Design a binder for this molecule. Structure first.
Ligand code: HEM
Ligand code: HEM
Ligand SMILES: Cc1cc(N)nc(CCc2cncc(CCc3cc(C)nc(N)c3)c2)c1
Ligand SMILES: Cc1cc(N)nc(CCc2cncc(CCc3cc(C)nc(N)c3)c2)c1
Ligand SMILES: C[C@H](O)[C@H](O)[C@H]1CNc2nc(N)[nH]c(=O)c2N1
Ligand SMILES: C[C@H](O)[C@H](O)[C@H]1CNc2nc(N)[nH]c(=O)c2N1
Ligand SMILES: [Cl-]
Ligand SMILES: [Cl-]
Lengths: 362, 362
């Protein structure tokens, strides 16, 4: 039953992948080899080209990603050879280091062994390799509320945070065979952080805001040709809105708009003053300014939308059918100022692709 | 064939309408009367209660409307008795006058005779009873580009605009039997306009911006129980974003962001400065300020979203299933600051409702 699914997804992937690579003739043989490998081993193994390209195709088919223009420049690290929790840990450390690149962020994915019989070889508990801890107890909210579950789950296993608003969560993952996951404290020399300051408002530094430079997603499954790489952390650079309009602005997150309104010298009393809208912009101006001033890669939503437009154009020219999720593609600040707002997108799911998978804890 | 459709939509509407009104017992008889009326006349006629309520239900089911909270306070004018183009003209004049109410805008709908055999008795060419003319010739763009087709169609019939950026388009509609539509110049004493000024920036008045106070939609069909009221102009007040983030901001409209950026003293050179986002807010602050300062009703998107939330709550409490269009419900400025952004809506179409119908010209 399962070997039928795997076989059909393999035929589809190889025939398409080799067509884009220009190896349409090599399809016939590679198919037969796969047919035997699935017949005997129950699962086939990707070549380095198939894996590297399949990961690039997956990014290209991420309907909710606005930065898909550079899908073909994805730096792919093949760590399907790891067996010990030290190799995995070091691989995670390396990914952070190489992807950060002193600030010149490289879109990188590290690929660990896939699910064998649906059985995870590696199980990463982090949603992002670099994230801030969250604490909620006695009506006291500290840090990132979105990380409350993982933080508590980490603290159930002997980890303890300093209870600042920006405690670096440890790398926590579980091996196949192990009943409990292990956790490792993040070497702070590997983590670039950016303090948020305003280009013309010196009082903005009184807010003492900051964020990590590199978003490394580690809660999604890379699916390539029937093979399920559940542990494949990937990263790009930030679109400024993600930090200033969601992470630091949301009431369910850092909730900083009232404090931002105070330091910029506007009242936060009346809706018709649009103080939230005004605070949102200045905060986002501060974020972009701070990242550029530090030398950490970042993109504004207007530039990102322009890049995504070229991606649309590039897609049509290559004969590729375009897919996208309008609700996620539009930026949370001035969405009507982008071309994305004024056109529709097909939200059909095309494989290879990245799929969200629920965490073992909460 | 048709009389089957009309009969089923009549059963559904009357049984539901009379249930909400508390006249569930009167359903049985009224149904039978309708059954005979459709049998003989080919179409039935609504009572004043059924029409008034059906129009309120239609507003309540407008998935793309954020201001549905006050659906039950809709002022319904029943002008199904008009026969001459003077009665229709005066009815249109009256609607404008009563709905404006010196600035205290009343949500009002004027209902003209429905399509008889699918044949329109009245055919309104305006998209809004009050709108600005648009001119495009010799690379010269004047007025509202969205109104270019109608403006040219009006000028084909002897009308001529002064070619300012805010020429009031004439009321233009066609009668059943007439081959051509008639046009009437709008009595300017009936039209409230609001000059746009900034609360703290005196240089904003140098832009010489303004907009009409009342949006009166006249391009949609009111469908109530199988009956098609193609000509039923309705109005509410403005949500500030509609004027400042779409009408005056869009490149395909008035395209004022660069000029707004200049008068507020910011550079319009770099994307990372977020000058578009910053200009958008200040322009929208100016719009809300100008309407409140003049005494013309208006709502900000934050207040509107709060009102729409009560509508959601009211819906659940009444046992009513909620329907909405997320893509239209979110405001084009700071959408993530509203609850609407963080929840989903069923975009199912429930009747009675308002349906868009293409204009006879372009
Ligand atoms: C080059 C820098 C990149 C930028 C600026 C970017 C931008 C974004 C943004 C803004 C989102 C939506 C976040 C939200 O508002 O919720 C997103 C989603 C996503 N991006 Fe990208 N992205 C980048 C690189 C990548 C890379 C390298 C991959 C993987 C190969 C990727 C795959 C995805 C996926 C899978 C999602 C959806 C995640 C989910 O389910 O929520 N992106 N991207
Ligand atoms: C009370 C004041 C009202 C406000 C503030 C309001 C607000 C809005 C807004 C913002 C939109 C979307 C416009 C856009 O962004 O494209 C909308 C759409 C709509 N509203 Fe309302 N509305 C109001 C009253 C009414 C009334 C009185 C009716 C009719 C009974 C109505 C029916 C609709 C319909 C049918 C649409 C969709 C029109 C289309 O197809 O584009 N609304 N409303
Ligand atoms: C590679 C990459 C780059 C970038 N700039 N942003 C992202 C998205 C980051 C991101 C941040 N916060 C939240 C999410 C979504 C979380 C999420 C949660 C659930 C339940 N289902 C989903 N499909 C997704 C994504 C990814
Ligand atoms: C009663 C009412 C109040 C209000 N504040 N806004 C509206 C919507 C006004 C409005 C302005 N510009 C454009 C539109 C949509 C035009 C439109 C165009 C097409 C092709 N299909 C549609 N369904 C709709 C609506 C209606
Ligand atoms: C494709 C997209 O859903 C469509 O163009 C919607 C987007 N949201 C919108 N929002 C508003 N206010 N008005 C519109 O016409 C639209 N159009
Ligand atoms: C219901 C709604 O479509 C859903 O919550 C979407 C809206 N758009 C979004 N946009 C972003 N950036 N992130 C999200 O998680 C969502 N969620
Ligand atoms: Cl993030
Ligand atoms: Cl309008």
């Amino acid at each position: 039953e399962e070997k039928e699914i795997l076989w059909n997804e393999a035929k589809a992937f190889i025939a398409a992948c080799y067509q884009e690579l220009g190896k349409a003739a090599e399809v016939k043989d590679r198919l037969a080899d796969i047919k035997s490998e699935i017949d005997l081993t129950g699962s086939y193994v990707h070549t380095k080209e198939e894996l590297e390209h399949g990961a690039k195709m997956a990014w290209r088919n991420s309907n909710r990603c606005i930065g898909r223009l550079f899908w073909n420049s994805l730096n792919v690290i093949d760590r399907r050879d790891v067996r010990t929790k030290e190799e995995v840990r070091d691989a995670l450390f390396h990914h952070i280091e190489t992807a950060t690149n002193n600030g010149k962020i490289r879109p990188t994915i590290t690929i660990f062994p896939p699910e064998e019989k649906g059985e995870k070889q590696v199980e990463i508990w982090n949603h992002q390799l670099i994230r801030y801890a969250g604490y909620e107890s006695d009506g006291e909210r500290i840090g990132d509320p979105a990380s409350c579950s993982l933080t508590a789950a980490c603290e159930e296993l002997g980890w303890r945070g300093e209870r600042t608003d920006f405690d670096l969560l440890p790398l926590i993952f579980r091996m196949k065979g192990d009943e409990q996951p292990v956790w490792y404290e993040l070497p702070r020399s590997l983590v670039i952080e950016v303090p948020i300051t305003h280009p013309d408002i010196e009082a903005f530094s009184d807010l003492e805001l900051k964020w990590y430079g590199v978003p490394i997603i580690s809660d999604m499954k890379l699916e390539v040709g029937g093979i399920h790489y559940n542990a494949a952390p990937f990263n790009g650079w930030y679109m400024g809105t993600e930090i200033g309009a969601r992470n630091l602005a949301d009431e369910k997150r850092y909730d900083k708009l009232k404090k931002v309104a105070s330091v910029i010298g506007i009242a936060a009393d009346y809706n018709t003053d649009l103080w939230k809208d005004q605070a949102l912009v200045e905060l986002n101006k501060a974020v972009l300014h701070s990242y550029k001033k530090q030398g950490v890669s970042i993109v504004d939503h207007h530039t990102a939308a322009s890049q995504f437009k070229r991606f649309e154009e590039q897609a049509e020219e290559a004969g590729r059918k375009l897919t996208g999720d309008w609700t996620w593609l539009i930026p949370p600040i001035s969405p009507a100022a982008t071309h994305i707002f004024h056109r529709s997108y097909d939200n059909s799911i095309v494989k290879p692709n990245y799929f969200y998978q629920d965490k073992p804890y909460e």
